[PDB]
């Protein structure tokens, strides 16, 4: 029994309750209470505690190595969406009415999605529909694919059963809930639900569409979940929160029923395709991973003896004219950046009173302007008021300052622009707060590797990671306004704004300057040489390079586990600003394993010494 708990492995709102596992066996996932999905992957075998922001009921695995698993949402859309590389690569919105049965016959690839009015088949590679079994008044209770290749078996609301061969009688139980489980070999069809039965039909339809009702034994009253296991075993989660593993050739002959202390019952379960492991999840959301074979052998053997505007125009205008003039920052930006012009939200940041985090700025950034530091202070205070993590991380003036100078022509605008800068662009920027966002900034480092895997290869060889992150972050703390150029840098910002629809670019662009230099960076051994190098007046064409980066941005599959994979968070809400999770609490593992060992040694020694203060009570 291996045990998985996600509150530790990415604190968040969990109480995980539905388990699902993939057919390659390295892909895992679980539906949490929010309808959020947490996926997990083996191969790199890192905790990968990354979720999918959905409101789902059903996670269906896709054979893609990156998954982009099919998720049936609350709005009945199917998101083709992962964590591995993040990326909601497709929003396959189509269905209405809760999709209840979502599954894929990966023998050829064939996605079934069953709503009450229409069972449809989608082709996985494009997610196009090929067949629509829309049937008036069927009100499908359920239906599933027969993996053998291939049948669609469907059930009506009224307990009627019909089969549909993919090239074109009943149970009789008007179940409200019903669950259809088809054996791996396509021989048995097992249906269970509200009534206490193991309804077995065969697929192998010797019974036609008829089911045999075996009453489920002992305390089974009804079930919550059904699954065929390993070979011909059928596993049911009874409503009694117990798991019963049945053997089809003997009907019941329950071979296994194991809950650890049964006082903590089971809410759901799923089997890894490698049938050796079963994972069940408790009603408290704890996952228990058991060797399944070992479990059957254990209980069975023991129990044996028990009895103007337009992004395209602007993209080109800003490239051919080059940049644009200042009086128009309001229109060009607000359009491209989807600003709400949420002046009310901004003003309520502007007037509260004294703000202690930045009184203070000239002490670290001694720019002797008592009006510019003030404007910087006002913007920074608003940002800290909005989200105090922003001053923890008091480095912030580093990038506020260039907009205080540009976009400072409109204070509310700077703030909103900046929130898009932190909300959409700097998505990993607050995850190691109060310190540099390194694990996190690995997204960038990986990107350095992706634009030029010689440069990153040697940067890691020469500059020993911690300071490289600091080298890079410092450029990303501003960004290239105090690096590259004081004023001519802007081409990249107008560019990123032109391409605000592509959040990844702030990282592609800083990477691009690394990409530009190539061999000129290879010889550096320290950040103290390299961060200044990038501040040198090199003849960077800038615009050529920005466009080169734009073309690099579009050269790889979205298959990459780029730490924080950025999404579109560009627009802000109106009236009041949106809430973003600009917070840390992630594991680096090794230093706690080390602290743990040290504290155990310290306390062991402490107690031996306290023990010997037997000679002290003596004097009392």
């Amino acid at each position: 029994c291996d045990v998985i708990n996600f509150k530790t492995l990415k604190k968040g709102n969990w109480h995980s309750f539905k388990l699902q596992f993939d057919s390659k066996g390295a892909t895992y996932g679980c539906l949490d209470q929010a309808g959020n999905v947490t996926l997990f992957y083996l191969d790199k075998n890192r905790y990968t505690n990354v979720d999918v922001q959905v409101d789902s009921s059903n996670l269906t695995f896709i054979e893609k190595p990156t998954g982009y698993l099919a998720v049936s949402n609350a709005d009945c859309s199917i998101s083709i969406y992962s964590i591995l590389s993040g990326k909601l690569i497709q929003q396959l919105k189509w269905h209405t009415f809760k999709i209840k049965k979502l599954q894929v016959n990966h023998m050829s690839g064939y996605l079934l999605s069953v709503s009450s009015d229409n069972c449809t088949i989608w082709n996985i590679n494009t997610y196009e529909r090929r067949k629509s079994f829309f049937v008036k008044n069927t009100r499908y209770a359920q239906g599933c694919l027969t993996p053998a290749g291939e049948h669609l078996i469907t059930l009506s609301q009224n307990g009627l059963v019909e089969c549909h061969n993919t090239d074109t009688e009943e149970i009789g139980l008007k179940l409200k809930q019903a669950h259809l489980d088809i054996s791996a070999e396509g021989v048995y069809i097992a249906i269970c639900g509200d009534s206490n039965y193991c309804l077995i039909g065969r697929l192998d339809c010797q019974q036609g569409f008829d089911f045999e009702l075996y009453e489920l034994p002992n305390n089974i009253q009804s079930v919550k979940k059904i699954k065929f296991i390993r070979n011909s075993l059928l596993t049911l989660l009874g409503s009694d929160e117990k798991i019963y593993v049945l053997s089809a050739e003997n009907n019941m002959e329950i071979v296994l029923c194991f809950e650890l202390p049964s006082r903590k019952g089971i809410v759901d379960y799923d089997l890894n395709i490698d049938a050796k492991y079963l994972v069940v999840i408790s009603t408290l959301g704890e996952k228990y991973v058991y060797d399944f074979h070992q479990l059957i052998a254990n209980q069975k053997k023991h129990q044996q003896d028990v009895t103007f505007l337009d992004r395209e125009k602007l993209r080109e205008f800003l490239s051919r004219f080059g940049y644009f003039p200042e009086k128009h920052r309001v229109v060009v930006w607000n359009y491209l950046l989807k600003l709400p012009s949420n002046y009310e939200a901004f003003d309520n940041l502007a007037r509260k009173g004294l703000h202690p985090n930045y009184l203070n700025l000239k002490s670290t950034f001694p720019i002797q302007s008592d009006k510019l530091y003030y404007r910087t202070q006002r913007i920074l205070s608003c940002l800290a008021h909005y989200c105090p993590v922003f001053a923890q991380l008091d480095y912030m003036p580093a990038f506020v300052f260039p907009f205080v100078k540009l976009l400072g022509t409109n204070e509310a605008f700077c703030f909103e622009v900046i929130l898009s800068f932190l909300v959409q662009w700097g998505q990993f920027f607050f995850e190691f707060a109060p310190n540099p966002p390194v694990s996190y900034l690995k997204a960038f480092m990986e990107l350095l590797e992706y634009h030029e895997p010689q440069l990153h290869a040697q940067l890691n060889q020469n500059i020993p990671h911690t300071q490289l992150f600091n080298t890079i972050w410092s450029s990303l703390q501003v960004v290239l306004t105090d690096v590259l150029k004081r004023e001519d840098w802007l081409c990249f910002i107008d560019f990123l704004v032109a391409h605000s629809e592509k959040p990844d670019l702030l990282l592609h662009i800083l990477v691009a300057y690394f990409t530009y230099f190539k061999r000129h960076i290879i010889s550096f051994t320290t950040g103290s040489q390299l961060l200044r190098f990038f501040q040198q007046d090199h003849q960077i064409r800038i615009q050529n390079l920005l466009q080169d980066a734009l073309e690099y941005r579009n050269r790889t599959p979205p298959r990459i586990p780029q730490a924080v994979v950025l999404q579109d968070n560009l627009p802000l809400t109106s009236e009041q600003y949106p809430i973003f999770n600009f917070y840390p609490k992630f594991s680096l593992d090794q230093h706690k394993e080390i602290r743990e060992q040290i504290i155990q040694e310290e306390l062991k020694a402490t107690e031996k010494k306290r023990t010997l203060k037997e000679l002290n009570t003596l004097q009392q």
Binding site: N218, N219, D240, E259, S262, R263, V306, T307
Partner: protein, 43 residues
Amino acid sequence: LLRKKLDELHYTQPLQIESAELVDKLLNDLLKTSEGFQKLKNK
């Protein structure tokens, strides 16, 4: 084996192998206490 009565009596709770050592007492009492009840009904 005590299991069978408990299931019929719907004491849908977990079992042990050590169960009998108490259940043999406690269970018979749920068939009986005043077993005459099955007849007090009829009376």
